[PDB]
Design a protein around this ligand. Structure first.
Ligand SMILES: Cc1cc2nc3c(=O)[nH]c(=O)nc-3n(C[C@H](O)[C@H](O)[C@H](O)COP(=O)(O)O)c2cc1C
Ligand SMILES: Cc1cc2nc3c(=O)[nH]c(=O)nc-3n(C[C@H](O)[C@H](O)[C@H](O)COP(=O)(O)O)c2cc1C
Lengths: 177, 174
């Protein structure tokens, strides 16, 4: 538990945003969800009140995504940025492919207080998934800048970058499934 | 002024080039320009306002796109076109213009918004770069209120698909 003005600045950006966003507290060992906005809630099918305080891995079932889960754990110890695809399940147990953006937030360079997670859903954009992910990445970068995670000076390069990573990961998703 | 102050306050804070044009005045004059747009063009806000954005053009390289612009304007509809433009030092550049109706009601838009994505600054990643622009833009259009609450997502995807469809053409078109 750290700075709270910072925390409500984040919450405010989270609630009026058109992209699924989540925040995770890195001072607690189980790494609990500490925010989850409505697009995220709408995507998964949960209330804020039934997942706040729990690791996000509840969206999984079993031992899928180990390779991706490995990338994830490494980024978290290092406090690094990471993008990655995950098999997830709604409260329906309805399957959905989850393009997840992870961004270290606040704290110190190697030990952030929080991690930010952004979920773009794969499959529902039909024909042009690359643009949609990239579009999502462009919106995300917009939010990350609003909370001061991305320097305003760099928002254009960063946007270019995330959007590039996003489509590339979409491509590798397409040529496999 | 008030609804114009809000729009200004969003322009000045933005990572995308934004421009506003008054749709009640007949020369359709620049009434706002944001810092990224200024940096892209190398102009000062004070030396371009009250002019029509066609000043960034030279000669007659944009006829076809200019007919589409005039159409979209007349009709109050959104549009995306590629334009050959030039900077304050006459350096040429390619301009993926996103045009959006803003204000008023569907029959009579108060203003038109313009968002310039410069093409060629992004290597082989133009489609993702442009669609990323599109994504940011949508977020900014929601931030003004021309998209609805559960409209941001599918508008964004729509727009980004058009964004890349147009840069794919631009890359084969020449
Ligand atoms: C901010 C943040 C957001 C996350 N979002 C998701 C998610 O949306 N879906 C998911 O399956 N895992 C998500 N995770 C990851 C899980 O919490 C966990 O880190 C991942 O499954 C690796 O955990 P494990 O190998 O210990 O099971 C997120 C993690 C963080 C820090
Ligand atoms: C909001 C807005 C932004 C515009 N931005 C540009 C621009 O960046 N470059 C350009 O060449 N034209 C731009 N235009 C269009 C021209 O000002 C003008 O609308 C167009 O050239 C109409 O055709 P005309 O010149 O034959 O009258 C913009 C128009 C609007 C309404």
């Amino acid at each position: 538990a750290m700075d709270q003005k910072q925390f409500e600045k984040i919450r405010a950006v989270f609630d009026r945003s058109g992209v699924a966003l989540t925040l995770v507290d890195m001072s607690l060992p189980e790494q609990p969800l500490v925010l989850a906005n409505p697009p995220f809630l709408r995507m998964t099918g949960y209330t804020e009140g039934q997942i706040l305080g729990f690791n996000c891995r509840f969206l999984q079932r079993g031992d899928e995504n180990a390779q991706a889960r490995a990338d994830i754990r490494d980024a978290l110890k290092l406090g690094r940025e990471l993008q990655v695809v995950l098999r997830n399940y709604r409260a329906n147990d309805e399957p959905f492919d989850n393009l997840l953006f992870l961004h270290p937030v606040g704290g110190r360079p190697d030990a952030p207080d929080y991690f930010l997670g952004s979920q773009f859903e794969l499959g529902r954009s039909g024909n042009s998934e690359e643009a949609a992910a990239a579009g999502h990445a462009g919106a995300l970068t917009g939010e990350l800048a609003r909370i001061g995670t991305v320097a305003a000076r760099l928002e254009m390069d960063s946007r270019r970058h995330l959007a590039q990573a996003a489509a590339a990961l979409v491509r590798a998703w397409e040529r496999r499934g």
